[PDB]
Symmetry: D2
Subunit: 250 residues, 4 copies
């Protein structure tokens, strides 16, 4: 059927850092007014739903805590359905709390999983232990492949680099471009891919993931990707707009 | 809901080369008898549905031409929904016919796409032209990432290698582990991921793709992957059996 | 000691394709007049010394056949000192003749080496056989890593790509940036690295190789590399000039 | 001429960790008795010459501090000859002191170089700053490519991984397999490659570097590499022995 659910990326679409993109509030309110399930997605694992709601509210956009879905929440949802509840975690804040709520024990003693998110406390010891466990068979999971956040701030992908180099193994990244996180988002809305659209600014992450997941896609040009980037692209967005302000196919 | 549709990989699951895996016939007939939509999937683009039906029949397994779905068919289905109908193709047989049926013009003059499948006629000239077009912006699509077929026979992935090296660009692979081909298979059965299971022998292709697509997965040990390969695996199969002969959760 | 020998790269330094770089003739004649051993180096394996002398003469630059040293000659020199004289060769012309003169038997029956140069006859069969032999333990050698020649013409590196993909092994590239070819060039002049300078236009090949080999280096800006490319460079050229016309430290 | 100088790798050749390889003492004393210049090489940057002499003496092998040459010393020697004397260093101990003796100022303010060695204090902040500087044009140098030391202890290569991922740039590794460190070792002995042999246990580092540098090579089987590893090897050692105990071609 038609568009009945909406997954909308955050950075470069609804927010520029801590400043809302013009029209974001009206765009979101229009969707909620119509009663369409909505998920605001972000590949970063540092913020809780409340943190995000506060960030949005500070910027003048009001939405419920419940609409947010981060790679940390997605990782917890992924692990919930797994056997084994012991993990060595390289991360802090949101991810840690989510894992505890998923019934996990966080330990550096016989862990079943090595989970990497983001932490400014990352150090030689963590890289060492994570590499040791992964090399020894621990299930290697990471929240998102992004190498850095704002500026050149190390992000999950950068923290995994040393661990991968030493162990010779790569983690399963839960976030975009992996199609699984889109599946997780759909399950959160109890929605089907055929009636869901994803709005994003990055052709290589939002669009690629949505496409592979079977979703209709809308690329906005207010972020990373530019219009000429679609010319040579294997697949292309269902629609393209300068920003969410002109989206009216929903 | 429950399992209502089935995607079953071919090589290492139903066939060993030209010899059927014991129990394959009974397994498939049981599924069809129950009236469950069935798709027999293969990442290789060389055979037509009829070729595959004949191969199966020669091996003592009788199934309709219609159940087969190859990376060539999937590629044609992918391109059908695309704008532009001119392509420079590096391939032969099945793929070529499928593209013509999808309304394509195959040309080395201003092609919109560069499509790579498999062809034993692959040569310096083809690599040159493909690289030239891709470097110049043509949409780069490939049927499957496999580097070789039986023995060390070059396969699609190997043919793309030189083109990627020269152009500095990578193609969008339509086949496994890409989740999209699973989506295409579901659409072929008009089925939902939540009620579909995929049976395969390769953890890194059948299982990875099925998992990302939201399908229940069954790993058989009659092919590439072995049981101990799941220990360190980020995700694991819903079920594991020596072969299709013992599968009875369908 | 001082500069007593000279290795000078060809393309982008002395020639632009078939046209001489202004000042090339005078530059070379000045070196020969002083009696300094000279080697004109090129990473490409297609031309014989006579072909190169003819190309230079056609462009108005007169030099002896003996001064030229190609990756094909270097590869033959490399193999001369090796045990085993049976090789499966993916190449044509110059390289083939050089190997025969080095005492080799070219065969697809129990070859000791798999040697890849350049050949416009490259095809599926060659990739297959080369991959089969390398996968089975044959010593994998390639003339140069360049992915393409003029335009997007496949070069040695591109021909190796498919073979590497299938076999899972990489060849030993004889040409630049490998320091060995510089050693081979020095031996050709019976010269020491401490009294030899190399002139080149590519920071990542001529300069990198010369530097690692212990040679003084001169970068000309008449080719691939540009002046701003040295800012972030780990190592830098001993000298930099727009072209050979202003070189006077020799 | 003949062998007049000797470069001998340490780990897996003369030492197993803190235990000497049987015959090491006699091997080394024999070389020094003959008056042949000797350099004991190691790719690791953590120990000073005195530390190494003490380690050897504790193991029962007596040699002068002066014979040792580490990747830290080699890096300092490399930088001594460079313009610019400001560097942001990710490392500790030996490397730091060597840089100060080379006339460097270590700072995180407008550094000319970003130098990575080894430090158990490596953290998010260091990765961030190093990545920021490299991304902004700083000359990226690293002591050695090894990903880990003993066990799964992070080594230089692992520390560079995150920096490379964020900046998109790779460093120039001073240590093996880079031929430059062999050149540096020769200069330390004021020796020519044609009269120098290198003894090592790793085909991919000691042997590869020696070969590219024009040295005669001796592979011992007391460490990383095994005899069957030479079968498919592009190049092969001049000689091969179980350990230094049987080396008598010097
Ligand atoms: Mg975004
Ligand atoms: Mg299979
Ligand atoms: Mg050049
Ligand atoms: Mg060693």
């Amino acid at each position: 059927m038609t568009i009945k659910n909406v997954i909308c990326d955050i950075d470069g679409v609804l927010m520029h850092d801590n400043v809302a993109v013009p029209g974001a509030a009206e765009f979101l309110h229009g969707i909620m007014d119509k009663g369409l399930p909505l998920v605001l997605l972000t590949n970063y694992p540092s913020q809780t739903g409340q943190d995000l709601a506060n960030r949005f509210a500070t910027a003048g956009v009001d939405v419920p805590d419940s609409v947010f879905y981060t790679s940390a929440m997605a990782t917890a949802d992924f692990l919930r359905r797994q056997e084994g509840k012991k993990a060595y975690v390289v991360g802090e804040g949101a991810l840690i709390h989510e894992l505890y709520k998923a019934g996990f024990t966080i330990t550096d003693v016989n862990p079943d999983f090595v989970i990497v998110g983001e932490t400014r406390s990352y150090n030689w010891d963590m890289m060492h232990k994570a590499a040791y466990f992964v090399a020894n068979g621990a299930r290697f999971i990471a929240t998102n492949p992004d190498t850095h956040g704002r500026g050149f701030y190390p992000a999950c992908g950068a923290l995994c680099a040393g661990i991968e180099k030493i162990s010779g193994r790569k983690p399963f990244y839960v976030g975009k471009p992996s199609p699984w996180i889109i599946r997780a988002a759909l399950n959160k809305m109890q929605a089907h891919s055929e009636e869901t659209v994803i709005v994003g600014d990055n052709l290589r992450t939002d669009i690629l993931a949505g496409f592979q997941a079977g979703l209709e896609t809308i690329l906005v040009l207010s972020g990373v990707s530019s219009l000429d980037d679609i010319d040579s692209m294997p697949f292309r967005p269902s629609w393209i707009y300068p920003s969410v302000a002109e989206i009216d196919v929903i």
